[PDB]
Amino acid sequence: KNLINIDKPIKELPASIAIPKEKPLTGEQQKMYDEVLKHFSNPDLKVYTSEKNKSEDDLKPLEEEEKAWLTRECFLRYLRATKWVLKDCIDRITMTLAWRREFGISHLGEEHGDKITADLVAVENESGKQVILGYENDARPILYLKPGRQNTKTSHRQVQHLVFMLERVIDFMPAGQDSLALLIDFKDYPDVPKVPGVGKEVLHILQTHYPERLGKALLTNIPWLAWTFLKLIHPFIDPLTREKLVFDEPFVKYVPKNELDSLYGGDLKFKYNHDVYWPALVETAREKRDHYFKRFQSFGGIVGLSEVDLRGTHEKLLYPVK
């Protein structure tokens, strides 16, 4: 049979998958990074409390949980996304801090006060339209998107759910990796009873507040018509972006068989069971956050700590702060 029956997220990256080595920063890159570190390490720093309602008359200092989010890799994700333009990098990080506050996810978990709770969005995942399961060849956690399993009508809660799931897959990042792999299944699922500015908001969030997170996007069951249109524009897409897109290729070339859903060629026989999968996902992510924050506090609770150190168990810091 070779099939492995599974119904819960795989908690840890298996030892069989190596963590890609990071290329050291150049002299100039290091200098600019230190400027970002200095900016956010300023004890008198105050940031907007909202993005959509930003006001110079309403600024508040960084909370403990926000300093824990402002990691070495966070700075690097924004520096790369902004093409190493200091001004733009600082402004972008600042606005994401503001948006996280406005959206209800600035506390690194409902356990610290987040308005976006698992209970608030749980109903949105009842049909398994989004699933966090497994890791691919470069240690990236996998997030499955199955739009054909839509179970709710358009609402802001749908956006809150997408953001919550994105935050959870980030919680699943193995120490040393900070990008994810998306596996999108466009197949229509007539088993999931049909129901009975969301698109613009989702677009804004994805294009503004999650820089350098897309490692790979695996597409399958692409509508015939849709496929043709993708193939027509494909030759005109930037090389770096083209390298992120995978279609018309066996998924097993990018994901270990024992880390891939059998529906797409893998050996994992996965059947979504909300009452089993959901609580497991919530608890697994919660434990990862608890560990991450405990480490953060153990290391002084300062801005600029490395996610490699926060998500690991080693005693000595691999990236001591300047």
Ligand X SMILES: CCCCCCCC/C=C\CCCCCCCC(=O)O[C@H](COC(=O)CCCCCCCCCCCCCCCCC)COP(=O)(O)O[C@@H]1[C@H](O)[C@H](O)[C@@H](O)[C@H](O)[C@H]1O
Q: Which stretch binds ligand X (CB under 6 A): 32-40, 132-140, 223-231, 254-262?
A: 223-231
62 Cβ contact list (under 8 Å, min separation 6): 40, 45, 47, 70, 97, 303
Quick one: 227 or 299, whose CB is closer to ligand X? Answer: 227
Pairing of strands 141-145, 180-185: parallel
Q: How far apart are CA 36 and CA 75, in angstroms?
A: 7
Q: Smallest distance, Å, CB 127 to ligand X?
A: 11
Pick the binder of ligand X from 18, 19, 59, 226 (CB under 6 A): 226
Counting contacts by CB under 6 A, is residue 95 touching ligand X? Answer: no
Pick the binder of ligand X from 63, 88, 120, 186 (CB under 6 A): 186
Counting contacts by CB under 6 A, is residue 218 touching ligand X? Answer: no
**Residue 9: is it exposed, middle or buried by C-beta count within 10 angstroms (0-12/13-18/19+)?**
buried
Pick the binder of ligand X from 76, 181, 219, 255 (CB under 6 A): 219
Counting contacts by CB under 6 A, is residue 217 touching ligand X? Answer: yes
Counting contacts by CB under 6 A, is residue 223 touching ligand X? Answer: yes
Taking the CA atoms of 299, 317, 29 and 216 in sequence, report the sign of the dihedral they define. negative
Q: Is 175 helix (H, G, I), strand (E, B) or coil?
A: coil
255: tokens are 């994901």
Q: Smallest distance, Å, CB 92 to ligand X?
A: 8
Number of residues that bind ligand X (CB under 6 A): 22
Counting contacts by CB under 6 A, is residue 81 touching ligand X? Answer: yes
246: tokens are 């995978």
CA distances from residue 317 to 77, 298, 314 in whole angstroms, order as listed: 21, 11, 7
Quick one: 10 or 218, whose CB is closer to ligand X? Answer: 218
Q: Which stretch binds ligand X (CB under 6 A): 65-73, 93-101, 207-215, 287-295?
A: 207-215
Quick one: 71 or 295, whose CB is closer to ligand X? Answer: 71
Quick one: 210 or 264, whose CB is closer to ligand X? Answer: 210
Q: Which stretch binds ligand X (CB under 6 A): 34-42, 131-139, 213-221, 290-298?
A: 213-221
Q: How far apart are CA 92 and CA 54, in angstroms?
A: 13
**Contact present, 77 and 211 (Cβ < 8 Å):** yes
Exposure class string for 116-145: b at 16+ Cβ within 10 A, else e: bebebbeebbebbbbbbbbbbbbbbbbbbb
Tell me which residues touch ligand X (CB under 6 A).
Answer: 81, 145, 150, 158, 162, 166, 182, 186, 202, 206-207, 210-214, 217, 219, 222-223, 226, 230
